[PDB]
């Protein structure tokens, strides 16, 4: 199917407690494969998936040099942001970045991404055209004018259309046994009486990859969206994910409810019910 590569940077200032911490992680789809932490005893880009381990010393040295330079850049950006927002040097603030590419089955770029935040709020974003910017406030407009002058969007476009796509395809080939393998959910419905007049039906999905999934309850064929409790999809720890959906039903009407499951690893969407 389609695939993505994404890098996530977090830069966090901490006055009185040394220089800002810089953490970077890299993902292919829902699989983390590298990390960098400036707080580590010996900061380096390090493997987090087995298939990246076959890359040589030139790769790892190159990525480490880049992360160290990046940490320095975002420490400077944190100081700049203080001036843009009239803030003092005493507070702790955070810059976040998230960029990457999506490719389709044929390995061609579907679209690119490069978006930044300040203190958890949108700051600036590269538009889908990869040639212009969306700035969220008057501070980000200052950055936008700088990046327009230095033609930064052109550099990003070159990366998103070139190296990003080429290396993602490389990773997809080296890790094809796992990255190009979907694991379907294992599903069942549980039943727990609340009282004499009500029961909880809970539809479980376990051991699936990737994380994208849809679980819905129907009553008499009608979606019960506003009455369903849906927990956030959660990692199991072995690369796979878990999710459940629950509805409270009148006792004796359990069989009027059906759970519908959609996942990439299933040939067709699944319909299941409580089997007493």
């Amino acid at each position: 199917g389609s695939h993505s590569m994404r890098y996530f940077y977090t830069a966090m200032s901490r006055p009185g407690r040394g220089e800002p911490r810089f953490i970077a992680v890299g993902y292919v789809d829902d699989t983390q494969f590298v990390r960098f932490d400036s707080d580590a005893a010996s900061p380096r880009m390090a493997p987090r998936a087995p298939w990246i381990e076959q890359e040589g010393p030139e790769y790892w040295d190159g990525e480490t040099r880049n992360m160290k330079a990046s940490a320095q850049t975002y420490r400077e950006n944190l100081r700049i942001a203080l001036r843009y927002y009239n803030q003092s040097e005493a507070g702790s603030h955070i810059i976040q970045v998230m960029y990457g590419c999506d490719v389709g089955p044929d390995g061609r770029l579907l679209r690119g991404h490069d978006q930044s935040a300040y203190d958890g709020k949108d700051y600036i974003a590269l538009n889908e055209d990869l040639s212009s910017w969306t700035a969220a406030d008057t501070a980000a407009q200052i950055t936008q004018r700088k990046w327009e002058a230095a033609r930064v969007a052109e550099q990003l476009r070159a990366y998103l259309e070139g190296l990003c796509v080429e290396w993602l395809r490389r990773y997809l080939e080296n890790g094809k046994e796992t990255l190009q393998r979907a694991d379907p959910p294992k599903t069942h419905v549980t039943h727990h009486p609340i009282s004499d007049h009500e029961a909880t039906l809970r539809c479980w999905a376990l051991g699936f990859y990737p994380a994208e999934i849809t679980l819905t309850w129907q009553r008499d064929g009608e979606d019960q969206t506003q009455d369903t409790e849906l927990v956030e999809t959660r990692p199991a720890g072995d690369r796979t994910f878990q999710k459940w959906a629950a509805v409270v039903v009148p006792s004796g009407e359990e069989q009027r409810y059906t759970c519908h499951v959609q996942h990439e690893g299933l040939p067709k969407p699944l319909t299941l019910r409580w089997e007493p």
Binding site: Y7, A24, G26, M45, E63, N66, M67, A69, S70, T73, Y74, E76, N77, I80, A81, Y84, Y99, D114, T143, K146, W147, A150, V152, Q155, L156, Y159, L163, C164, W167
Partner: peptide, 9 residues
């Protein structure tokens, strides 16, 4: 493979 960051905010 990560992007090279050049220009500041």
């Amino acid at each position: 493979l990560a992007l090279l960051t050049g220009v500041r905010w």
